[PDB]
Amino acid sequence: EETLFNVIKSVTRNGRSILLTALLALILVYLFSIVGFLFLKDDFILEVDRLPDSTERACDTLLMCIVTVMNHGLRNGGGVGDILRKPSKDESLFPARVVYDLLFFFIVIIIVLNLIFGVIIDTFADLRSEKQKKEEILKTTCFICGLERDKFDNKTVSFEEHIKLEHNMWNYLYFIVLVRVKNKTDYTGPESYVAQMIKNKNLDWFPRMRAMSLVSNEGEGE
Amino acid sequence: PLIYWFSRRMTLWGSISFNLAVFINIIIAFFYPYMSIRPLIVALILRSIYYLGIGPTLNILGALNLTNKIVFVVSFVGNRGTFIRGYKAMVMDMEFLYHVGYILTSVLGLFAHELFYSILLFDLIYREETLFNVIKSVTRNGRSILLTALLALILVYLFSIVGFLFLKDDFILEVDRLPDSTERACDTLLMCIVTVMNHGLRNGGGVGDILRKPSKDESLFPARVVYDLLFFFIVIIIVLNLIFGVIIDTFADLRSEKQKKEEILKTTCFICGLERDKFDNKTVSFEEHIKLEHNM
Amino acid sequence: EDPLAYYENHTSQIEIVRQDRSMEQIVFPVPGICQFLTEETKHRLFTTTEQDEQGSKVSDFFDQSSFLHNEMEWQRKLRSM
Numbered sequence: 001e002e003t004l005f006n007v008i009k010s011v012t013r014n015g016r017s018i019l020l021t022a023l024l025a026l027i028l029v030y031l032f033s034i035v036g037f038l039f040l041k042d043d044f045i046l047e048v049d050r051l052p053d054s055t056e057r058a059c060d061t062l063l064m065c066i067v068t069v070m071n072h073g074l075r076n077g078g079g080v081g082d083i084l085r086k087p088s089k090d091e092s093l094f095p096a097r098v099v100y101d102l103l104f105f106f107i108v109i110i111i112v113l114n115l116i117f118g119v120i121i122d123t124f125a126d127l128r129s130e131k132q133k134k135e136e137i138l139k140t141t142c143f144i145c146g147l148e149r150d151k152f153d154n155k156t157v158s159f160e161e162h163i164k165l166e167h168n169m170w171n172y173l174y175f176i177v178l179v180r181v182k183n184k185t186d187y188t189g190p191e192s193y194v195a196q197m198i199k200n201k202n203l204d205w206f207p208r209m210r211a212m213s214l215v216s217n218e219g220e221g222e
Numbered sequence: 223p224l225i226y227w228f229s230r231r232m233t234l235w236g237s238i239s240f241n242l243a244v245f246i247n248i249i250i251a252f253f254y255p256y257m258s259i260r261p262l263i264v265a266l267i268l269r270s271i272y273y274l275g276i277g278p279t280l281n282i283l284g285a286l287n288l289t290n291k292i293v294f295v296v297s298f299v300g301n302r303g304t305f306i307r308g309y310k311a312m313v314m315d316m317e318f319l320y321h322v323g324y325i326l327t328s329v330l331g332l333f334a335h336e337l338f339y340s341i342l343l344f345d346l347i348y349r350e351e352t353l354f355n356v357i358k359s360v361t362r363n364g365r366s367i368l369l370t371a372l373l374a375l376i377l378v379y380l381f382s383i384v385g386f387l388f389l390k391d392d393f394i395l396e397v398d399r400l401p402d403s404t405e406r407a408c409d410t411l412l413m414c415i416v417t418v419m420n421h422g423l424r425n426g427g428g429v430g431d432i433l434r435k436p437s438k439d440e441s442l443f444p445a446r447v448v449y450d451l452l453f454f455f456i457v458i459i460i461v462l463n464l465i466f467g468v469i470i471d472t473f474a475d476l477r478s479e480k481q482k483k484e485e486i487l488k489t490t491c492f493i494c495g496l497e498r499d500k501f502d503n504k505t506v507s508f509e510e511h512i513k514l515e516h517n518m
Numbered sequence: 519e520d521p522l523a524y525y526e527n528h529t530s531q532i533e534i535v536r537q538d539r540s541m542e543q544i545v546f547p548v549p550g551i552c553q554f555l556t557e558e559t560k561h562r563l564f565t566t567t568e569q570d571e572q573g574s575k576v577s578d579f580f581d582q583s584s585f586l587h588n589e590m591e592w593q594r595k596l597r598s599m
C-alpha cells in the first residue's frame with residue numbers, strides 16, 4: 001500500500017528530530033531522577049506483586065530511580081507524581097512535592113512528548129505541500145521545454161496537442177536511439193548535428209521556453 | 223604558529239569536550255552511588271574502570287574535560303578575537319558568557335560534587351541545530367503559552383471557589399502516612415486550589431476523578447455531574463489543548479519562514495537580487511552571474 | 519494488414535534548436551527496438567524524474583536514455599523466449 005507508506009514517511013522523514021527530542025526527554029528525566037534521589041528519595045515507593053512486603057523503595061540507587069521515573073513516569077498521564085506515594089497536605093514538604101510534580105507535568109508531558117507529536121504534524125503538512133507542488137508542475141507544464149499552460153491560450157495549437165505530439169518526450173528518446181543506431185555515413189543534416197552535440201555533452205539542442213506553436217504568432221509578426 | 227594551531231582544530235576540541243561530557247554522565251548514571259575514535263574511547267574508559275576503578279576513572283575524565291574546555295575557551299577568544307570587539311563586548315557576549323558558566327560548572331563538578339556534571343548535558347541543545355529548532359518551536363511563542371497558563375490558573379481559581387462555596391464536602395483526598403487514610407482537603411481556600419490544580423489538571427478526567435464518587439440517587443448528583451463535565455470541557459479540552467495548538471502553529475510558522483528564506487537565498491543573487499527566471503535564453507547563465515559578475 | 523500501419527505507427531516528429539537558433543522540425547522513422555519499451559518503465563520515468571537547478575528536467579531524462587536502450591534490448595531478447 002502506497003498510502004500506508006506515505007503515512008510511515010510522515011515519521012521517517014524527520015526521524016532525526018524525533019530521536020533528538022527523545023534524547024532531550026531522557027536528559028530531562030535524568031535531571032528529575034537526580035533531584036528525586038537527593039530530596040524526595042523517601043517518597044519513591046512502588047507496589048509490586050510477588051510470584052508464588054507489597055510495597056518497597058525503588059530509588060535506592062540512581063539507575064533504578066531513572067528506570068522507575070522513565071518507565072512509570074512518561075507512560076502515566078499525570079507523570080511522575082502519580083506513581084509516588086500520596087503526600088500529606090499538612091506535611092511540611094507538601095509544597096515542594098507539589099511543585100515537583102507540576103514541573104514534571106509541564107516540562108516532560110506537555111512540552112516534550114507534545115513536541116514529538118508536533119514534528120509528525122509538520123512532516124504531514126510538508127509532505128502534502130511537496131506532493132501538491134509536484135503534481136501541479138507535472139500537470140501544468142510540459143516535460144521537454146517546461147512552458148506553462150497559460151501560454152497556450154487563444155492559439156490554433158492547444159496545450160494538449162503541444163505535449164502529445166509537438167513536445168512528446170518519447171519521440172525525443174526514439175530519436176536518440178535512432179541516432180545512436182544509425183551509421184555515420186547515413187547521417188543527414190539534423191541527425192549529424194545532434195550526434196555531434198551528443199558527443200560534445202552539451203544539452204542545448206533541447207527546446208527551452210519556446211515552441212513553434214507560440215512562434216506562429218511570431219511568424220505573423222515576422 | 224602556536225595560537226593558530228589551537229584555533230584551527232576548533233571542531234576537534236569541541237567534539238571531544240562534548241564526547242567526554244557524555245561518557246561521564248552515563249558512567250555516573252549507571253554506577254552512582256559508588257564505594258573509529260568513539261569506540262576507542264569507550265574501550266579505554268571500560269579498561270580504566272576495570273583496572274583503575276570507577277572513582278579514579280571519573281577523576282581522570284573530569285580532569286581531561288576541564289583541560290580540554292579551558293584550552294577550548296582560550297582558543298575561542300583568540301580565534302574570534304572578542305577583545306578586538308571591545309573588552310565590554312566580550313563580557314556582554316552571550317557565547318562568552320555561556321562558556322564561562324560551563325567552565326564554572328565543570329570546576330564545581332570536579333570539586334563541589336559529581337552530580338553537577340549532569341547539567342552539562344544541556345550542551346547537547348547547542349551541539350544539535352535540529353534540537354535547537356525544536357526548542358525554538360516553543361520559545362518563539364513562549365509569551366502566549368505563559369498567558370494561556372495564566373488563563374488556566376484563573377479558571378482553576380474560579381472552579382476552586384465554586385467547589386469551596388458549594389461542593390466543599392465532596393473534597394476528600396487519600397493520603398499514606400509515614401511510619402484516617404482519607405481526609406478533607408478543601409477546608410481552606412488555598413489548599414483547595416492546590417488540590418484542584420495539582421490533582422485536577424494532571425488527571426485525564428479532571429477534577430471529578432479525584433473527588434469522591436457521587437451517589438446516583440443523591441439529590442446533589444446532577445450538580446456534581448454538571449460541575450465535573452464543565453471542568454472537563456473548559457479546562458482540559460479548551461485550555462491545555464490550546465497550548466499544544468500554539469506549539470503546532472509555531473512549528474508551521476518556523477517551517478514556512480525557513481522555506482521562504484532558503485528559496486530567496488537560492489533563487490536570487492546577493493547584490494542586485496534579480497530572480498533566476500530573468501537569466502533565461504541568455505549567453506550568461508545565473509550560475510556565472512553570481513559566481514563572477516555579482517560576487518559579493 | 520493495413521498497408522498504412524507499419525509506415526504510420528512507426529513515425530514521429532520532434533523539435534530542435536540548431537546553432538543559428540533557428541528551430542526546425544524533424545520527422546524520422548521509429549526503429550523497431552523502440553517499440554519494445556515497457557509501459558511500467560515509461561510511467562516510472564515520467565513520475566520519478568526530478569528537476570535540476572535550472573528547473574529543466576531534460577538533463578535527467580537524457581542521462582537515463584542509455585539505460586532505457588539496454589532495457590529495451592533485454593526485452594527483445596526476453597520476447598525471444
Ligand SMILES: Nc1ncnc2c1ncn2[C@@H]1O[C@H](COP(=O)(O)OP(=O)(O)OP(=O)(O)O)[C@@H](O)[C@H]1O
Nearest residue numbers: 138141142143144145162163164167168169170564
Ligand atoms: N512533454 C510532455 N508534457 C506533458 N505530458 C507529456 C509529455 N510527453 C508525454 N507526456 C504524457 O506522457 C504520456 C506518454 O504519452 P504517449 O504518447 O506514450 O501516450 P499513449 O496514449 O499511451 O500512446 P499512443 O500514442 O500509443 O496512444 C502521456 O500521458 C502523455 O500525455
Ligand SMILES: Nc1ncnc2c1ncn2[C@@H]1O[C@H](COP(=O)(O)OP(=O)(O)OP(=O)(O)O)[C@@H](O)[C@H]1O
Nearest residue numbers: 487490491492493494511512513514515516517518
Ligand atoms: N551574488 C551572489 N549570489 C548568490 N550566491 C553568491 C553570490 N556571490 C557568491 N555566491 C555564493 O557564495 C559562495 C561564495 O563564493 P566563492 O567565490 O567564495 O566560492 P569558492 O568556490 O569557495 O571560491 P574559489 O573561487 O576560491 O573556488 C559560493 O557559494 C558562491 O556560489
Ligand SMILES: [Ca+2]
Nearest residue numbers: 185186187188
Ligand atoms: Ca552523405
Ligand SMILES: [Zn+2]
Nearest residue numbers: 142145146167
Ligand atoms: Zn513544450
Ligand SMILES: [Zn+2]
Nearest residue numbers: 491494495516
Ligand atoms: Zn545580480
